[PDB]
From Swiss-Prot, chains A, B:
The lineage of its organism: Bacteria, Pseudomonadati, Pseudomonadota, Gammaproteobacteria, Pseudomonadales. Disulfide bonds join 23-30. The gene is OXA-10. Its EC number is 3.5.2.6. Dimer. It comes from Pseudomonas aeruginosa. This is Beta-lactamase OXA-10. Its main location: periplasm. Changing residue 132 to S: Increases resistance to ceftazidime about 30-fold in P.aeruginosa strains PA01 and PA14. PANTHER family: BETA-LACTAMASE YBXI-RELATED, PEPTIDOGLYCAN D,D-TRANSPEPTIDASE.
Amino acid sequence: ITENTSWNKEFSAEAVNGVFVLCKSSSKSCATNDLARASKEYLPASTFKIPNAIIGLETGVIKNEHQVFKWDGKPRAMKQWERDLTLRGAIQVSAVPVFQQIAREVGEVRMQKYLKKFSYGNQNISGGIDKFWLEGQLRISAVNQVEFLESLYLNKLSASKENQLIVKEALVTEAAPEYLVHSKTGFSGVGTESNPGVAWWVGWVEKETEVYFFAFNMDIDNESKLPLRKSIPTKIMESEGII
Amino acid sequence: ITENTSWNKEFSAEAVNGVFVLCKSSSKSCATNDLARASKEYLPASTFKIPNAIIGLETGVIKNEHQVFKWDGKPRAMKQWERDLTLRGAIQVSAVPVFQQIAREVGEVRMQKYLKKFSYGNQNISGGIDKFWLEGQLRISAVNQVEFLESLYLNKLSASKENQLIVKEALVTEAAPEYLVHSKTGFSGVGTESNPGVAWWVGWVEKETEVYFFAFNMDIDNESKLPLRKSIPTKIMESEGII
C-alpha cells in the first residue's frame, strides 16, 4: 500500500473526507490517497448485496441466475423497486427489500459462517438479520473490499465458481470491446453532522488485458453529494488512463 | 413461427435482401419478415466464435476465463492481429488467427461432435478445419441461431455451466440497470450482386424480466451496407417496443 498525495486534489474541491484504494493487477499493488482511512471500517450498506447475493445463491435461497423476484404490489421505499426484478436488476437498482428477505432466509448462523469464510470486515452481524449491514455493527474497510472483490474476480471465495460468475455478470455496469466495468454503489444514510453516514463505490475494471480493483468510501451527511461516490473515483481512474 | 411482412419495408428502403427473426421469451414465440429466408442457411462467419469459444473452453484449449491470447510477433496484414487479447477482446474484435488456432487445436473430431451436440445448422465442417465457417460448407439459419442462443442462455448447451457463463459474459455489449444485451456480429466478406456475401447480427436482449432472442442476416455486395446489420434490426426492435 502506498500513499498518493495528489489524489487529494479530487477530494479537496468538494471538502470530501473519503478514501480511494486503487490496485493494479492484485491487492499487493495498492495506492490510496489516505493510508489511515484505507483500513478504517464502515457500514457497507448496499455494497453488502455482493456477498449476500453470493451467499443466497450458495445456500439455495436464490434458485439460479434467472430467478425473478416478484413484486407483491405493495409500497416499497423507491419507485424503482416497485416491479419484478432479476438478480441483476435488484442489485443494480439496489432493491433492499429483496435482499432483506434473502438475508432472513439465509439466517444468522449461515450468515455468520460465510462472512468468516469471506473475511468480511469485522464479521459482526449483530443488529438484526435484515439490517446489520445498514444500521447494525457490521463494518468493513476499503482495503478489505478490494481483497474481497479480488477473491471474487479470481473465483476464490468459498462459494461455487458458477455462483461467483453469476454475481460477476450482475455487477457489470459498463461494456465495450476492450473495456468492462464491474461495480456497486452503497449509501448508509446522512447520519448527523457529528456522526455522518458513509457512501461507497467498489468494483474493478478490465481494460484490454489489465484489471484494476477499486474501493471508494466517503463521509456523507448531505444526499446532494452522493454522485461524488462515482465522480471522484472515475476522475482518478481517468487521470491514471483507466479509460 | 409467424410471418410479419410489414418488416420488409425496412429491407426495401436500403435495397437489401435479408431476414430478421425475433422471439419473445422462448423460441416457441418467434416472428420473422420472411418465412422462407428465415429457414434458409448461410455461412455463419464470425457468429461461429460463440460455438468455437465454448468448445475451446470445454476441450481445455482455452484454459480459463482469464486466459490472455498473446501476440507472437505475427506478421499479420491487420493491426488488430498484433495485440494481446482477453477472451472477451478476441470475441469482440477481428482476431482471425486466434479462432483459426483454436479450431485446429480442438480439431475435426471434437469440432464435429460438439456441433452435433449443439445442433449447429447443417453441421458440415468440410472445407478445412480452420476455415469451414467462413469459406467451407458450414451453413446455418436465422431460426437455428435463435434456438442455439436460447440454449446458451438457459445454460442448456452440452458444455459446463461455468464455460457457458464465461462465453455469456464475453458477449455482453450493452448494459444498463434493467437492460442487458449479449450479441455477436458476423460477416463473410463483400461479394457481388449475383454472388453476395452474408452479414449477421445475432444475440439476445434482457429488458426488465423479459428476454428477446434475435437473429438477422442479409446478402451483401456493398461494403457500405454493412452497418445495416445492426440498424435494420434495431429499427424493428424499436418498432416492436423493445428499445
